[model samples]
Target: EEEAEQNLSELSGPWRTVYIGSTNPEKIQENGPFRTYFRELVFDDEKGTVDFYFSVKRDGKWKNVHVKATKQDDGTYVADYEGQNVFKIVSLSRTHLVAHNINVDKHGQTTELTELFVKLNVEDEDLEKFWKLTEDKGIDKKNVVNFLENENHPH
Candidate 1:
C-alpha cells in the first residue's frame, strides 16, 4: 500500500528499459511496438506527472514517442497508451524502477507487462546534448529521415 504521496522529481532522469516480461508473446518479439526502450524521462513535480520519450519501428520506420503519465492518489501512474494503462511501481530507487503495467484495450483484451528500467548514466557529453535538442523542437524531429539509408541493415 502507498504510505504517502511520492516526491515525483526523484523519478526524473533518463531511463532505458532492460527487460520486459509479458503475457503476450508478440510484445516480446523484436521491433514490436510493445518492445520498449526509454530514451529519456522527465517528471513534472508540480503536476505529479511523468514524461517518457522512446522510439519504435513499425512497418519498418523509426518513430519517436512522447507520452505523459499522471500520478494518482494511490501512487500509481495512469497513461492512456496501448489503450488504458495503469502502472504501479513495484520498487524504485534513484537509479532504477520495477513496474507492473496492466493494459485494457479497445477489444477488451487485457495484458500484463512487467518491466525493469535503469536510469541512464550520462558519462558521455554528446548524448546529453542530443536529448536537449529534442526538448528544443519536438515536431522538427518527426521530419528527420534517411539516416539509416545506405546502411547494411535493410528496412
Candidate 2:
C-alpha cells in the first residue's frame, strides 16, 4: 500500500495536456460542448494544492477556464470557482482521473457534471480513439451555424 501510495504521489507534479470529457446531452447540444483540453496542471504535494488551466471551445473559439484544487487528508480534492462551480475529485489512477462538478445557478438551481481526464504520457491511442468516435457519430466538424445562432443577448 505504501508503495502504491508512493507511486501515486509521483503524479504530484506539473502535468501538461490533460483532457476533460463532456458527456452531458445538454452541454453537447446547447453548448456544442466537446471535451476540454487542459494546457497545464501544477500540483503541490507539500501544500496539497493543484492549479489548473484549460481551454474549451465555445462558438468556434477557445475559452480559458482556470481552477484551483486543494487536497484533503481523506485523499479527496475540492475546488470552487465563479461563485457557483464546485468540483470534487472522485477517482484517480496513474493514467486516468475522474471528477464531478457541482454547479449552482443564480436562481439557486443545482446541476452536477462528471468529467474524465487521461494523462498525455500515453501514446496517441486515446486521441485517435476520440477522433474515431467523433467521426462515427458524424460530428466531424462543429456546427458553426448552430453555435453562432445561439448567441443572443442575456435576459
Candidate 3:
C-alpha cells in the first residue's frame, strides 16, 4: 500500500498533467476555465501553501496562470482564481498526484474536477495506476481528457 502520510515538500517540482475528469463537460471543453495543462507545483509545508503554474487556452490564445492555495485545518486548500476553489489531495506518491478540486464561480456555478499528474520522469506501469484510480472514481473513459498527447511543444 502507498504511504498514508506524505511530505508535500518532497513531492514538489515539475509535473505534467495526465488526465482530467469533470462532471460538467462544458467545464473541460474548449476554452473552458478548467481546461488547464499543468507545468509545475510548488509546496511550502512550513507556510502551508501550494503554488500552481499552468497554461490554458482562452479564445484561441494560450495564457499562463499562477494560483496559490492556502492549506486549511482539515487538510484541504483554498484558492481564488477564476473563482473560489477548494482543493484536496485524493492520492499521492513520489511520482504521481491525484487531486480533486471544486470551483465555485462568481455566478454560483460549481464544477467538480479530478486530475492526475505525474512527474516528468514517469514509468509506463505508473500510467495503469492512474487508469485504475480514474475508473474507481466512476469517470467514464469518454469523460477523461488528456492534455499531453495533443501538445506539439515539449515542456
lDDT (10s digit) by residue, model 3, range 14-91: 788999999889988999988888877889989999999888888998888889999999999999988899999999
Model 2 C-alpha lDDT per residue in residues 51-98, reported as the tens digit of each score: 776656677676777788887777766766534565677877666667
Per-model CA lDDT versus the true structure? 0.76, 0.58, 0.85
Worst-scoring 10-residue span by lDDT in model 2: 146-155
Off by over 4 Å in 2: 1-9, 12-24, 27-35, 72-75, 122-155
For candidate 1, the 10 contiguous residues with the lowest summed lDDT are: 146-155
Identify the runs in model 3 with alpha carbons over 4 angstroms from their true place. Answer: 1-7, 122-155
Pairs with backbone N, CA or C atoms under 3 Å apart (clashes), candidate 3:
none
Clashing pairs in 1: none
User: What's the residue-level lDDT of 105 in candidate 1?
Assistant: 81
RMSD of 2: 12.1
lDDT of 1 by residue, 1-155 (tens): 33334566756766778988989877657766678667778888789888887777777777678889999999899997778999898998877989999988888988899999988544445556875886687747566563322221232
